[PDB]
């Protein structure tokens, strides 16, 4: 009634927030998953990195999980907060 049915995508806000919460919960409490975020912490906190740091970070992330899993390159740019996500599933192997 308020939005003239333009707010229909907000009908499941509780369920989507619950699913996000569940995904965060299994994000810290899974083996071969939390150390990837720890590596992200070390990469983000330690700035002024060259390219070779980026490839060794890539294979160090790869070595944590299985050889058949999928990698995702979620690029962030401070200027413009533009998150480009790239599909490199079984590409760097």
């Amino acid at each position: 009634q308020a939005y003239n049915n333009k707010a229909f995508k907000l009908y499941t806000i509780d369920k989507v927030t619950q699913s996000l919460v569940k995904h965060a919960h299994t994000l810290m409490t899974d083996a071969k998953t939390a150390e990837i975020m720890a590596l992200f912490v070390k990469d983000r906190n330690a700035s002024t990195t060259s390219a070779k740091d980026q490839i060794i970070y890539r294979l160090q992330v790869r070595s944590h999980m299985s050889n058949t899993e999928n990698m995702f390159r979620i690029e962030f740019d401070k200027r413009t907060l533009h998150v480009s996500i790239q599909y490199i599933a079984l590409d760097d192997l």
Binding site: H23, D30, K32, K52, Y57, F76
Partner: peptide, 25 residues
């Protein structure tokens, strides 16, 4: 080839962090 004061930051992730970030977006 040192990139000082970097602005583009890369997150490498499996399906779990990707799906979590997709739900956030």
């Amino acid at each position: 080839g040192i990139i000082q004061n970097r602005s583009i930051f890369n997150l490498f992730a499996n399906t779990n962090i990707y799906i979590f970030f997709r739900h956030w977006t």
